[PDB]
Paper text:
We develop a hierarchical approach to designing multi-component protein assemblies from two classes of modular building blocks: designed helical repeat proteins (DHRs) and helical bundle oligomers (HBs). We first rigidly fuse DHRs to HBs to generate a large library of oligomeric building blocks. We then generate assemblies with cyclic, dihedral, and point group symmetries from these building blocks using architecture guided rigid helical fusion with new software named WORMS. X-ray crystallography and cryo-electron microscopy characterization show that the hierarchical design approach can accurately generate a wide range of assemblies, including a 43 nm diameter icosahedral nanocage.
To build such structures by helix fusion using our building blocks with smaller and weaker interfaces that give rise to cooperative assembly, we systematically split each DHR at the loop in the center of four repeats, resulting in a hetero-dimeric structure with two repeats on each side. Tetrahedral, octahedral, and icosahedral assemblies were generated from C5, C3, and C2 building blocks placed on their respective point group symmetry axes, connected by the split DHRs heterodimers. Following fusion, sequence design was performed at each of the two new junctions. For another design, T32_Wm-24, while the full cage did not assemble, we were able to crystallize the polar-capped trimer component (C3_HF_Wm-0024A) and solve the structure by X-ray diffraction to 2.69 Å. The structure clearly shows that both of the newly designed junctions (from HF and WORMS) are as designed, matching the design model.
Author numbering:
A (entry chain A), B (entry chain A), C (entry chain A): 1 to 269
The structure:
């Protein structure tokens, strides 16, 4: 279906990007051989130095244009991944049945479209590129929650999916309006790690950090935004360690990482 | 399933292609350092110039072989995408139930196999590479039409899929036998845009341009083939603008693009 | 679902790898222009030669670090493909229903995790990189066998899947404990080709070569291991020719390749 279409388009970008990288390598090589030829033939030091500077200026321009093509190829790749993830979000919302979760997933399609369209307009912006990455990770976490809700029909899992899909929409409009915000950037990642864990205490704690960063970004108090980031940083690290201790380990640090997330959310509420 | 297999093989091509690009960069660097060493030590101008020309000849050969590896990596990627798309076409035809559409999808598998096998035989051919691209786009449009037909069981949608899958087969054998034909190249793309639109008037208009380009290519009248291309060019541009005005816009140009496609098909029939 | 997640991560690797390749090209170009400048200005031959050697040493280090990044990018790609293939293996085992085949598929998840984790620890090892490739191919063959078993519910196909999934686990722990073993490396590939063929005689013949290579690797008789490789080499080539003669050909060599695999397995038992 649509999955094969994206792989076909992403592969065209890789072939085209590798084609342009070789184009830059080929041009830089022509300049070197031409410079060595002129340096060995000419005797005027003034002309030799000017031939060297124009090659160094052109070589620096060749590299910059190649960084631009990689920049545009990355935004085009992130645009295809965002649309594919949003398309997966709406179909999973259909397989649930709730018209309310269908309205929530419909906004993610609108959020993914608008954020990916602005990144492709000016890929040189690093904030619009990173904000689109986290929105993609938020949609992926929402899709993983929706797919789990339709496995056994557990009413807690279905409500778990609704609360975290709506929270993903919340932690998406925030980074869309404030891409350069480190507090909103970290509270989103803490929610993605809290969605995959499935803990009710971790989901309500991550969303509270999103609202704290939202209110701190309503006004323009920089000391207020930095406090939410440090609170969201320790929460995110506690969830990543809890995921490592559950996948492997010997249950020793697994109980230790629980109190890490518990104490981190304690001083944040 | 098969989708994960293609991604695994396409990723091996990207790693291998990046490995060979660095191999060329490493060899070009060795030649530059060796040339600077010999130019600074030797005093005979005759020997210095010959050392420079053999490096420029070898550097030009290194770049050409790297363009060849990118050329072979692109054909191998297009071969994997074509087979994956044809595999998706036959299973969607099974989910419909019509044995007639199963015979139509069976030809696409044969058309995708033969076209992708000839492109991998000599990837330096640009016509066989581009003709395979449009055949892939034709199969993707056929798959999107087949998946929509099995959504609600609408009898119009199921017949809409049969007419456009057969038309995709028609606009595939044509570009296979005439890869260097611009008229057949454009009538195919007009059909792909007409399939996604779902308009009955746009589907019969695009196929009529395929038959006009087919009869013009039966004989060898070049003025006849150019007339179909210009007719298919305006039809394709009208469908792409109609898709832009339906996705966004304010319904103003949406009605304007309808008369564009209407008038374009008028002077083509 | 998970398929879109892997494509998103694999595309980030390609963009990042292309970003680092250009970084190496940009640094190598700066060294060339700086060297040409110093060679044209300075007159002391002793200083010129030392400026050349330090550039040749740095250029050789730049290329080596770029080979390392390609090395680490390949292991990260093979780790994502292995986990995605193992995830596909467990769900197909669930769709069968046998708790025994679910325990077999559960080991592949453990085998794919452990082998991919050791390859990412030291990607410079070529044996751990190649052993992970064949384990991926073994899981893919197991998934293709499991998907075919749930098509028509044929009891022979369901048992065909169980025998070859268990054999895939057998030809996975072997290459995991002996990555540098050519006999175990070839008996695995002979099984992958024997799984796709579906021949009962080819499956029991490939597994017998796995047990022969297993017992030869129990001890450390090098002449014993080389005998199994030559026996597994001819079996693998006979299955690849049998696949070519069945896909195309004119049934002439198709019967000839059958006696090839028959005689190859004859002198191996």
């Amino acid at each position: 279906g649509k999955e094969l279409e994206i792989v076909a388009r992403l592969q065209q970008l890789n072939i085209e990007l590798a084609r342009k990288l070789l184009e830059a390598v080929a041009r830089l090589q022509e300049l070197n051989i031409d410079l060595v030829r002129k340096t060995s033939e000419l005797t005027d030091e003034k002309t030799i130095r000017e031939e060297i500077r124009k090659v160094k200026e052109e070589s620096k321009r060749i590299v910059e244009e190649a960084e631009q093509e990689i920049r545009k190829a990355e935004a085009e790749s992130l645009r295809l991944t965002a649309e594919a993830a949003a398309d997966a979000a709406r179909k999973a919302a259909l397989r649930m049945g709730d018209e309310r979760v269908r309205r929530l997933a419909a906004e993610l399609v609108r959020l993914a479209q608008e954020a990916a369209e602005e990144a492709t307009r000016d890929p040189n912006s690093s904030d619009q590129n990173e904000a689109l990455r986290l929105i993609i990770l938020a949609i992926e976490a929402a899709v993983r929650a929706l797919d789990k809700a339709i496995e056994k029909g557990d009413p807690e899992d279905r409500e778990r999916a609704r609360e975290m899909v709506r929270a993903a929409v919340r932690a998406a409009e925030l980074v869309q309006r404030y891409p350069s915000a480190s507090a909103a950037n970290e509270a989103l990642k803490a929610l993605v790690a809290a969605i995959d864990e499935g803990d009710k205490d971790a989901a309500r704690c991550a969303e509270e950090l999103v609202e704290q960063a939202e209110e701190a970004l309503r006004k323009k108090n920089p000391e207020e935004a930095r406090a939410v980031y440090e609170a969201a940083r320790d929460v995110l690290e506690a969830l990543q360690r809890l995921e490592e201790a559950k996948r492997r380990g010997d249950e020793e640090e697994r109980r230790e990482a629980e109190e890490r997330l518990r104490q981190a959310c304690e001083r944040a509420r």
